[PDB]
Symmetry: D2
């Protein structure tokens, strides 16, 4: 009867989430900047396992090698003071005006080289803090008009970028993998690799595909109206779910970054059911924004709420799968047959099987109800804790 999170739950938060000041395209900041050290302390008190950062969240853009050292030093002391970990790091290649047409796929070649140097310096920092995953979110790679970007050349430049980071990582002997985070649009009119599917396909063309996976975000796939649990299943099937970003989104519209559980509640349920059943072992990272209506007390309530909602859905999904009535319904709907090979007897025996065509009764087969609505109502009852 308790939903208190603990560091064993692997809940993580970006510094930029609870640290968002509330600036949006139509208004000024409503909250003051948070000292990252303060953010690490508050989160550890909430039961969080660790934090993530962009380079620029930690070390303000343009810091001397000196102030850099200082910033890192204060941070690492806070991590030591609280026991918090840093499992993922990432680069800011979107805020500075120099990236207005992108970083790795900017039309200006000198900007692309600078984007690579800026990334490499942060990968070094990441490994030193102990991160296992390095995330790439190409928020500015894309276009508002069709002639501004040849997409085949852009994809060449993107592959070229990732191949070089792969060479760098292997040449240095680092233990760190990359994760591509897709987004369909915003802040560009259209962004390159806009969904989980496109990023997965792209990875298979890199020189060392085994170094790269995806970091899918709940709200981003939903901005394309796609089913996030299905996308995640596809990522898992491919062996490529290296990391994941949890939050909430109300439909196809601007990227809302609501706290996890807000937005589409049933998708959050089916997502939790899948992560826990596939035995996902990575961080449960929250990429969310406390609404700018909130003061700092609402910030910490919003962060706590992400963890609570995960722990409640986890208990509801486990009870659903544990319910014998549910196991019976799953058999009535033939989930068991879905898992059996269609033709383990082989092509030849299938061709010779008259019960598979010549003598197949299509009419009987047709008449068989799938019993999916009772199964779904069972899932609803479990979700709402209304199971008798």
């Amino acid at each position: 009867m308790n939903y208190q999170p603990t560091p064993e739950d692997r809940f993580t938060f970006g510094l930029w989430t609870v640290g968002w000041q509330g600036r949006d395209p139509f208004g000024d900041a409503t909250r003051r900047a948070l000292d990252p050290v303060e953010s690490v302390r508050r989160l550890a008190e909430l039961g969080a396992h660790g934090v993530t950062f962009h380079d620029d969240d930690l070390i303000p853009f343009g810091s001397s090698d000196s102030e850099r050292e200082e910033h890192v030093k204060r941070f690492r002391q806070a991590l030591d003071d609280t026991g918090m970990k840093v499992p993922m790091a990432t680069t800011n290649l979107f805020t500075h005006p120099v990236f207005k047409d992108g970083g790795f796929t900017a039309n200006d070649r000198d900007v692309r080289r600078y984007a690579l140097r800026k990334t490499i310096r942060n990968i070094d920092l990441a490994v030193e803090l102990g991160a296992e995953t390095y995330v790439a979110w190409g928020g500015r790679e894309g276009a508002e008009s069709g002639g501004a970007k040849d997409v085949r050349d852009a994809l060449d430049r993107m592959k070229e970028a990732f191949d070089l980071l792969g060479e760098y990582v292997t040449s240095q002997g680092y233990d760190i993998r990359f994760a591509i985070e897709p987004k369909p649009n915003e802040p560009r009119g259209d962004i390159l690799l806009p969904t989980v599917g496109h990023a997965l396909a792209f990875i298979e063309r890199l020189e060392r595909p085994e170094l790269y996976g995806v970091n899918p975000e709940v709200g981003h796939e939903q901005m394309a109206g796609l089913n996030f649990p299905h996308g995640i299943a596809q990522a898992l099937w491919a062996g490529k779910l290296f990391h994941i970003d949890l939050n909430g989104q109300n439909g196809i519209k601007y990227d809302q970054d609501l706290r996890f559980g807000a937005g589409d509640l049933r998708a959050a349920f089916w997502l939790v059911d899948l992560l826990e059943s596939a035995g996902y072992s990575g961080p449960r990272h929250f990429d969310f924004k406390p609404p700018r209506t909130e003061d700092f007390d609402g910030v910490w309530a919003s962060a706590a709420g992400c963890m609570r909602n995960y722990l409640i859905l986890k208990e509801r999904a486990a009870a659903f799968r544990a319910d014998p009535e549910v196991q019976e319904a799953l058999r009535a709907s033939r989930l068991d047959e879905l898992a059996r090979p269609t033709a383990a007897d082989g092509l030849q025996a299938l061709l010779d099987d008259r019960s598979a065509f010549e003598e197949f009764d299509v009419d009987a087969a047709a008449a068989r109800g799938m019993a999916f609505e009772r199964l779904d109502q069972l899932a609803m009852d479990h979700l709402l804790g209304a199971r008798g």
Copy 2:
């Protein structure tokens, strides 16, 4: 000053397009059935290069081996009479009630085996009529609720299906490739492999990936709000654009299948520009529905309109790329630099290049306008034939 199509233009139409009777989820048919032989004759008069078919369009479901032979015979005589070709064929695994939970990923194993036998019989037919591409549209593979379909098991069953068709094709020595046609939803709540990206990623897990590519459709990627020209560029980059379905769509809503050029006009322009510039050599296939408001005269006007609109956009895109003013703008916007390698000097020389980081002037770089709006207005002027 003429936009008359000719068979050298490679324009093709499915039998199901001009043959649509007008039945929709809320109304009865408004037009009588068209004899496929009549459809082949009318289309050849319009300047079409050939037709495509589902098995069930040609041979009514449940035909005896005898009436089958008859139907094929009348068809092939019409092809001989007109000189029309059949470059693509496909299977109907969605209309019959037996496929209500799918064909290759139906939960019932006996339905999946039947779906494979039904497909294989049509591949044989396809090769005999001379088709080079066999399209798979899994319209019923998917779900309306989350518990009804384990997506990792479904993807196993899908891969299993495609692997067996690949074994069959290679064992028979057939010259024919497969093309997966993605759709995000409808008629299922969510459909598996919902975008070009997901189908591409899936193909890399098949046993003989080189046998499979995509058949993207304009309206389907738009039902996910995605940029179709970008998706097509990604398909081309991968060497996987085996075929393409042209039509029009007004946004995220039911699959409209409007005639090509209707819908998003500028996307149609940038698509034509890309197909012609990449030297796409496949059929320009129209998958469209003449609106049920139309009688047969409007049917043939709608079909002609698809071809006309392609030929007009083709001329406008060629004039755009041929315009010296446009070539100058492309250089001002640095499309030329996009095409140059970021670091052909290699990782080490990039790390040692102080002009790439230490001494990079970010501020100057930032100040450089991309000149994309003038380039786009030039593209608009060319599209509207308002270029001075």
Copy 3:
């Protein structure tokens, strides 16, 4: 601890809902036709209060005045046998090919007159069966292309139609009101009066506005990505919520008509909270389609599920509003101030109030958090029955 519905709950179902045979734009029917008499009996056993009908659901199109009488007679006997009521009736002006360009706004004038006669005959039938609300869903009023429909002339023809039905109803002394049911698209490319807002605005231009209100449907407003509870609040504010259609929808896509509670679960919660708190007294009508994957047992399970899910949300919303902790949070978020007039002192005293501008501390006001995230987490806890 029980969610059994009873006729006092006012749950109603259209004959076309549980009676849907499963025909969709890509497949044949998966279920046989249901005898309306059988549908009335099964629903009464489930605890339903009554049924609704289109004319054509009850009396097959083209029935002789004789077979008509017969059909009505069998129906009314079933109503008498079960105690079921018929609170709403409506017209089918969309299935027959003659309505392919619409009924009231068809370009052909003779089709518009026929649509009015067909409606008037059914209003007579409706009143005789005791219906209080007559619904109009103009599914075919609209267009796929811009030149096909002058929308100002179409709106003249629509107003003209509704004015004549208003004249007819008042001249006959009937006790029956009209309800306009908006839909943004499908089966037309764009449909006229596409949202609750447009229908409300239109009503204010009719000759007797007091005779007309709206019949909003959950899924239809969601096909425009709008917030249905807000739309319903606007309808209530205007005194125009005459009836309502409950179901579920997963986003902007084809009209899914899922059972109520499926789709966007939190919106269903906030909708129930609003209906019960505003004291909506009309039927709780379900306009849903049992998925064609289902046999008749799944049909009846789907129908039961709509009622169950309403009764569970009703209990969760009542517990939320009854929670003292929630009443305290509502005061912390100043819902109490929202309800107070801004300036009951009047314009002049507001102009003279220096505390309202000259001496207003904007900075203090700004700093005040709204406490909305804790309030929302409280609402989530109550919804999931995880409230301590």
Copy 4:
């Protein structure tokens, strides 16, 4: 053969459009602030008729009554120097943190009174500069969660606000009308009065409805996937199109504010056709953002492009309507009958007309094609200047 705009064309621009510095939710400004005086001069050179402003664009927030006077003085001198007019003004009730929960419908009553005082002061300024229309865009009126805002109370507070501004305007004898500008979302999760329809309906509940109309924006209705030309037709039918905001939008996504003609090109065509044919006489106002990829030269090219694209579409729509072939097609599609009353003979004669029901041939009527696809292809040919 010329598309040069002139002040007689009535093209206007907000100061905030060409003045946008490029700050977006993910990046810093890419352009320096423009002096409004400079913006007025550049626009007059481009052929613009005048400018619009928010209070805060002209007079920086917190200016002394003194610096205020100064700012106004420099502006009005620029207007005198160039002959530019100021036909519309509006209030900024969204940027300052104090408006984070709204202005007129903020839960805090003291914030609502301050919002009214801030507005009234600017209406005075507006009238003095000669504006005829005062626009209200309630960008912050709305919510991210359902319990944070009782929408019936919010609508009471909104009506209360508009009623008081109406009292103020009539008490002062000012010649100025109000225009409500709808937006469905962003920056709030859901915004109140989200479409043209909802704002129109709301206006009919104000105390002096004749003082208020709508200021619809191309991109905002498109963010709900609605047809903007239809929405505008409805506004015109109601006598409520007081002003209009022109720009471009690519679908359902963040508010892009692309230059007019970009986005959905065919909708822009049908919009121009309607404005010119209904004889809309108001400003053609552009609410657009030059993309942050642009330097100031691209800013002025983007602004010129809005005007050019309007003038090209205006010529294409006029040629379409002037084409005798088009006038013939319109008769073949029975646009002429659409404009004729359905029943000017009255209810009684319609009831007695057996040719309207008893003896109506539904089958013949059904068989009649609407000829809409040829009409639309004619419209396409005219749009692309490919009309023989």
